[PDB]
Amino acid sequence: MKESVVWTVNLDSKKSRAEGRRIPRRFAVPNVKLHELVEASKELGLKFRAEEKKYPKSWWEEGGRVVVEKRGTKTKLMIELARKIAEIREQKREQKKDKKKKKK
Numbered sequence: 001m002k003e004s005v006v007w008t009v010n011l012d013s014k015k016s017r018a019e020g021r022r023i024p025r026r027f028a029v030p031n032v033k034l035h036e037l038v039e040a041s042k043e044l045g046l047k048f049r050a051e052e053k054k055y056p057k058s059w060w061e062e063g064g065r066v067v068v069e070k071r072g073t074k075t076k077l078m079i080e081l082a083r084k085i086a087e088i089r090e091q092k093r094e095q096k097k098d099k100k101k102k103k104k
Helices: 034-044 075-094
Strands: 006-008 048-051 066-067
Touching: 006 048, 006 075, 034 048, 034 075, 066 075
Parallel strands: none
Antiparallel strands: 006 066, 048 066
């Protein structure tokens, strides 16, 4: 019931510590996915929130930032957030807009 701030890059493995990595490689999702970050919170209706830079009218950006209600814990929240986000990434694996696209 508190507030936590997480960026899209932290949960991304492709982003090294210099890029901003706070998630363990074991559950890290390479390449941030809006479908995974937002769709994850939708599953619980209230766990984190996606924020966007003060001025979206710009180029060369990391996309957006996400905040999780929890606070107190650090990477574990990322592990939990990745736990929900990892499923959605996995959802893209189970179906690839092709296996289901053609039904026959």
